[PDB]
Ligand binder design. Structure first.
Ligand SMILES: Nc1ncnc2c1ncn2[C@@H]1O[C@H](COP(=O)(O)OP(=O)(O)OP(O)(O)=S)[C@@H](O)[C@H]1O
Ligand SMILES: Nc1ncnc2c1ncn2[C@@H]1O[C@H](COP(=O)(O)OP(=O)(O)OP(O)(O)=S)[C@@H](O)[C@H]1O
Ligand SMILES: Nc1ncnc2c1ncn2[C@@H]1O[C@H](COP(=O)(O)OP(=O)(O)OP(O)(O)=S)[C@@H](O)[C@H]1O
Ligand SMILES: [Mg+2]
Ligand SMILES: [Mg+2]
Ligand SMILES: [Mg+2]
Ligand SMILES: [Mg+2]
Ligand SMILES: [Mg+2]
Lengths: 48, 313, 309, 312, 312, 312, 312
DNA sequence: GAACCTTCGAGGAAG
DNA sequence: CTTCCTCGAAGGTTC
């Protein structure tokens, strides 16, 4: 799951988010098992 | 509210209104969203109002934002994620978006999905973000600064135009019924004639005329009260302010029409250079009363007959 | 106090003063707030004074700030959040607000709402009914979408001799100085049409009357004091007279370029152009021409020279 | 001391000096702060010197700063915050302040208060900072560079004028006592007439003559030493420098007096157009040696008799 | 070394040397710093060289910087804090300094102090920096760019002038010793007459002739070698270039000596309008080959005899 | 996709297409990269599509960027380093990249290596990078604005031109088949005639007419249906657009048909002078609607009779 | 590689080679660098190649940069610190360098030192860097473009001229020898005659002709092949470019043959003034296609007969 | 009518 | 974003 977690964190950083804030945002998500797309999709939605 | 809600109430703009009506029904005749639309025109013609109408005609929710508020790509992608199938995203002043975001908007507009690439190149992987179908509606005062790649994605162009007297008169009549005031059709035309063709200006004049008519009169805007109100305010029958008339008079009386420099003209009327060049000069040029030359401003024959002075080449 | 508090005390500005009364009386009749007002025009004519008069006539407490003090959007948001229904916000020198701040003011003026990003989250604030008043000398510097939202535009005009005469007498009573009507008229003629200048001259004449006289202004003390200050009966200073004299006696009235004329009187070019020419041109003593500037017949008659075509 | 400290020691400027006396005395009778004063005019005429004299006559401490040192609104606010009742603030080269900073003085000068933002977030506030009575004194050579609303706030305007031969002679004699130098009145008058009307120039000539008098002479300045020193410096009895004389000689001998253009004249003397127009030409015009016309520069009758030619 | 180190080695500029010696000697007797001095004049005459000579004669360490190196007010303040009693500060190309910095020297040069803003920003105040006695030396090619208040503060003005053939001949000889090349006295005069009165040009020509004489010669700059080398460089015996020769020849052959307008001439020679007026014409006028007139420029009798045509 | 993939599918541009075919096949026989190629001309003629065809004909991976997207040397360095032997780099709007970016492009194009300064302060070194063989392809709307030294590096030039009716009619049909729209030989001919000769414009109109035929008909684009739709789009039977009509009408009604300059006109109507000159003036000139004169553009009799105004 | 490496390989420019041979050989007897050299003339004549030849003959490394590449003093300082003893620094388009940067070279060229401010805040201090010996090679189009203080510091000047048919023929024959290709004397002569006297063009055309001969021919270049290849491109029967034809055509038809100024003409053809002035106008003038007059450029009868119009 | 000189006005580039 | 300034035009005089 570390790939999907890092993928979401790395993908979020590619959208301009800071590594720390991007990590916290993705780290703040409860389900780690969710697919990389869902992790980034939910994380991006939560940023609104 | 003073904003029309449907094409039934949107006065004027018949050309752009006719085009959008056909396209909206054709899109509704299919399970497809409306093509990306871009609105062109000077400020105050109703671009924002039209955006609300398009959403109401489409029967879909509307998300409103402005170019200056979008500072990072995450905002745009996050905002797009909040959209439901067919939602309309309206971006005002789209010409002011930062270039870093424009390069991402292409994928959403053309593909409705985003792919992010990572890795040095020897080892790499992509992540795909799928977006629901949506329609972007952009409003801009300057078209020339939009890059060719973005311009090519917009499939519909709508030129806004200045309202004509018969339609601008109807906007006044409508607004007068929102308040509790009776206005004679001849009086409504007198305000429209001086509204410089902009609905926002007509509304401002009507408010001022209302205040006079209910304090110095019986609270009714008849042709006589309208003349008195349009006399306390020095707005000429062509819409020229007191200072606008003073500019033309000075050029004709003291310089024989020019050429005259901006600085020389500013000190005569006791005004700042910036005010003359930005507040008053632009409307006088549109009406064709003055022209700009390498040697200075010059008054045209159209100005002579309006101010009432004899002209000679 | 030097600043009038009500329209009954505010002398002159018949055009602006008359219009504002109608709009203020009408607003009270409907129990509504007054539309946003922009005051603009030359320096010292009464822009700031009128802003306080409007607040007193509306019967509201005035909130006050200035363009240079507001440096970021966060400042304006805090100021606006303190507004209560019917309050009046006055921004002096409004032309200095940064572009980042003017954009926030668009929605607040037209829609009474603001959308501010503020752990990052967006807070939507709905403003109560309020009136914004702005004063500036550079109205052309404001953004085009901002000017379009102001509902009342007040352009200030210069005062006439009857009004300046009454202003000087009013100020004399505040200083409890006795001044005769004909002496007061002599100061009005020299005030260049600006109320602040009329007060400045009175302060200087008062000092002379207290040191070189009996502390009373009369047709005799005024003549002496004005001679010491060297202010002509048309309001021309020592340097103003030197410019006209040089043009008439050395160049036969012109045309002469600004550069040549500045070096001759030993003044700086920027100073002659921006500090001395403006009043001479508006009064018609000088005219600019494609080949230079020339002294008009009005200058010859005033300086006491035989005019020659 | 080299700089006069009281009006009794300040020679000349009768108009400005006479006016300031009356306004200072009147303010003392009312026991209130002096109105704001602006001093402007050519270089070296005494603007800075007068600012210190005003403070001594008023009997208060002078707080000094300069335009180039004030770079942001935070700097000016801090200075104003350190004022005490009756203090005098003197700002030299006041025209260099940024335009965004001048607008802070508008309310300070007229109403004695400034509006400042304080706090943060929900605690941010705008508050009036109230100032005690004070006098602002400004000195500048480029008055026209100041904004129209600022000049209108100064209640007293002092325009400096050039000095005359009797006053410059007395100034030279005074300076000759600061340094230990004996000078004959005839030699003092000889230098004064060559000082172009500026006190700073009179002091510079005296310093150069002193160096010569104590190296090439007996350490005393007399008609014999003054004439020799001035010949070495090559400054004409009218104050014309070596290059000033070369200009007139060329115009009179090659162009018969003109009209001649500045470009043509500059090339003949091997100088460049900028130095001739900015350094040498201005004094020649103000003293009547050259006349500017639409056709070019022309040498006047006064120039012919000075160089010794015949005005045909 | 190429650059002279003392007044005994500095050939020419008699008017400047004679004055500087008197002022330097006087300053030593009083044990005081020398007054601020400005060196100005045409390019390559020796302004920078003289600045180092002044320091050697005064016997003190020289601190060096330049106008373009001082980018902001903070830079100048740092340099001034490094001054020690009696130090000499030399600023080359002083006209390049920005106005915001030039106005900081006004106080330093007259009163040896500076106003500075200090503090944590929460609390901050203006304080005076007191400078020790020092001498500012400035060098510039165009004094017209300096503001009037700055030029008025320099106590000693040094205007450089072009060199005569007798003195310029010595400079060529002195340089030959440094290069260890024997030169005949006749050849030294040939190089001098072609050096347009400028020392930098004389050294350049000598270097080129030196290279030629040691590659195809016997390592001696004889009268025969110099003529051959100067022909290769295409330098006329009056220092005229082929372009200069073309101008005069065209005026004599196609217009009978003129008058001819600058536009008309520029076309017939395929030269750019302003290049002819600023690069080639100024030397021709000063030497007297061309004379400007109200109706155009004319070739003088000197140009006829130099080109060999018959004057009429 | 709509755009073709090979020269077999690329319609028109016979000259450019025929030239590139020879050079592309010749490069393969020698097994070497193609020389740098520059494509220029009006917008929408197919410059970008040609780049994809060249890559496909060469059998190489294409990389794409734009002038305004590259802001600093470090940006271009990363792209150029991420290249494989034979790769093709396409840069759109190459005339808009900053002067500092071109520095790296010269050495890369000429010798395939670059020198990058690295470090700051005490760190000041440079790194030499050797690039593999690659082909640069540039595209611009304005060729005369391209930097002279840069334009010399391109070894091949392709000048795009407007398509004719026989070509556009086939293109319109091709696009209709991709959209599966049915169009008659007459209706497809009408759109081509009014498409202003540009494929991008023809594609825009075709998509819009479809929405019309799906309401005012059975989805079949008939000649009569096409004409009613084109009038609804405000498209003249001569291809003039809303802006074209507004330009000519403004000249005739307010300026008597001209002459008027490009700038003066662009001020009355809210359009950028670059857009008028880049997209409107070139077509209007070739079609004879406007003529250029010593004082600007003037509307010809054809324009008057077409617009319905009495000619001069 | 095609670029010549030594003087024996550099064909033509005999006047420049002969002088550089003497100066380089003389500079090698002594253990010192060559004096700073300035090369000027039309673009593309081979001045950059000359810098490489000098570096190889001197036996040192060559570093390259350009005028527009330097925007602030910090850039020039970093470059100079990267030079080894005796290295050669080549600066292209030196006339386009900023004035504030140019004044930093003055000390570097004449004395090999630079005065710079280093650090920030309390660390800000002036440092005196001492550079190792180096040779600067500058390139510019005209000598009149540079300032007098810079031009006076260059010790060698070289004017480069167009190559004649005998030389270009050898250059084409040499270039066609690096590529294993065969070309007949008539083809080489025809290609050179069409090469506008510029070696850069001669090499570009030769590559294209080779490509055509390999695909559309038997791999041998003959007069018949050169004509067809050159006919396929836009090169006219005497080398005129498409831009050249555009200019002549515009002058005759739109200006009636002139007179017209290059400023007003440039804006009508949409070409940048610097390109038409420096690249195209010089050749048209030197070959009689265009004539220059007091009022402006005028097309000669030769142009009329070339374009096929009547010189009425 | 060819040539010089002064003056103003609007761009644009160097802070 | 602003000041500074330079480039281009044109009015007037003289031979
Ligand atoms: N067709 C119309 N009918 C009635 N009112 C209209 C119409 N068009 C514009 N208005 C009025 O114009 C006002 C301003 O309209 P907007 O949509 O803000 O114009 P705008 O183009 O958005 O101006 P901006 O955004 O400042 S550039 C609205 O509040 C309406 O009252
Ligand atoms: N009197 C002199 N005797 C000998 N050499 C001299 C003399 N004057 C100048 N030089 C030499 O001339 C060259 C140039 O002199 P500089 O002092 O650098 O000229 P400059 O005044 O600095 O020129 P600038 O800085 O461009 S205004 C140096 O090699 C000096 O050694
Ligand atoms: N004498 C020569 N013999 C052979 N090739 C030459 C000669 N001179 C120039 N070249 C060729 O010219 C090309 C390089 O031109 P450059 O040396 O760059 O001229 P340039 O002045 O630098 O042109 P730029 O950089 O575009 S201004 C190479 O292909 C050389 O082979
Ligand atoms: Mg709007
Ligand atoms: Mg106020
Ligand atoms: Mg002072
Ligand atoms: Mg020097
Ligand atoms: Mg090169």
């Amino acid at each position: 799951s570390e790939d999907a977690e890092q993928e979401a964190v790395a993908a979020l950083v590619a959208l301009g988010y800071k590594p720390q804030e991007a990590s916290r945002m993705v780290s703040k998500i409860a389900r780690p098992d969710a697919s990389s797309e869902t992790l980034i999709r939910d994380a991006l939605r939560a940023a609104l | 509210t003073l904003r029309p809600q449907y094409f039934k109430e949107y006065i004027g703009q018949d050309k752009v209104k006719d085009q959008l009506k056909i396209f909206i029904e054709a899109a509704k005749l299919r399970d497809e969203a409306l093509d990306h639309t871009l609105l062109f025109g000077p400020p105050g013609l109703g671009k924002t109002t039209m955006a609300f109408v398009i959403a109401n005609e489409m029967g879909v929710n509307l998300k409103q934002t402005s170019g200056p508020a979008i500072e990072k790509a995450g905002d745009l992608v996050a905002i797009l994620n909040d959209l439901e199938p067919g939602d309309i995203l309206f971006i005002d002043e789209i010409h002011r978006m930062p270039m870093a975001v424009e390069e991402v908007l292409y994928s959403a507009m053309e593909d409705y999905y985003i792919d992010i690439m990572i890795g040095a190149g020897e080892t790499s992987r992509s992540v795909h973000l799928d977006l629901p179908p949506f329609t972007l509606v952009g409003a801009t005062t300057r078209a020339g600064m939009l890059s060719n790649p973005l311009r090519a994605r917009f499939g519909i162009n709508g030129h806004m135009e200045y309202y004509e007297l018969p339609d601008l008169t109807e906007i006044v009549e409508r607004t007068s019924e929102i308040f509790e005031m009776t206005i004679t059709p001849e009086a409504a035309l007198e305000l429209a004639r001086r509204s410089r063709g902009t609905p926002r200006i007509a509304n401002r004049l009507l408010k001022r005329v209302r205040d006079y008519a209910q304090i110095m009169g019986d609270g009714v805007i008849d042709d006589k009260i309208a003349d008195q109100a349009l006399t306390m305010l020095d707005v000429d029958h062509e819409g020229l302010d007191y200072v606008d008339q003073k500019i033309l008079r000075t050029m004709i009386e003291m310089y024989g029409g020019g050429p005259v420099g901006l600085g020389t003209l500013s000190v005569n009327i006791a005004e700042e250079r910036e005010t003359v060049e930005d507040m008053y000069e632009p409307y006088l040029i549109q009406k064709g009363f003055i022209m700009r030359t390498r040697t200075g401003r010059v008054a045209t024959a159209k100005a002579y007959e309006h101010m009432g002075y004899d002209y000679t080449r």
